[PDB]
């Protein structure tokens with residue numbers, strides 16, 4: 001896979017961020033995970049929703065460098081969002097959320113599953129530690 005640079009435009013929520021990519025603003029959705037929704041229609045927030053959102057917003061707004069890494073299949077979803085692994089100063093945001101119990105490994109669609117193992121191990125560790133959502 002290969003990492004390419006991108007620039008933060010804005011964090012939307014725990015798993016969705018807007019970036020300027022190759023000079024065009026696009027919304028990206030983090031591959032392989034799912035954070036709790038905060039703007040569920042009328043609902044206004046699932047437990048850990050707000051928590052997942054600030055974590056991601058904090059990681060990306062404080063980075064010196066952001067990089068996106070596409071997997072091997074489809075690079076956009078049916079909503080037109082780019083599907084990638086996002087790295088903030090070389091730290092993968094997708095894994096950081098899972099490791100904290102603020103996301104679960106979800107939407108696993110072959111062939112975009114290069115880091116599925118890696119993420120599954122971090123989830124196991126967050127479950128074995130009873131963090132956030134596994135609390």
Ligand SMILES: Cc1cn([C@H]2C[C@H](OP(=O)(O)O)[C@@H](COP(=O)(O)O)O2)c(=O)[nH]c1=O
Nearest residue numbers: 016029030031032033034077078083107109
């Ligand atoms: C991460 C991911 C989500 N999606 C789809 C599945 C879900 O569609 P539906 O809206 O049909 O449920 C939705 C999950 O997105 P959100 O978690 O942002 O809702 O996006 C993909 O199509 N491929 C992906 O890899």
Ligand SMILES: [Ca+2]
Nearest residue numbers: 015034035037
């Ligand atoms: Ca979500």
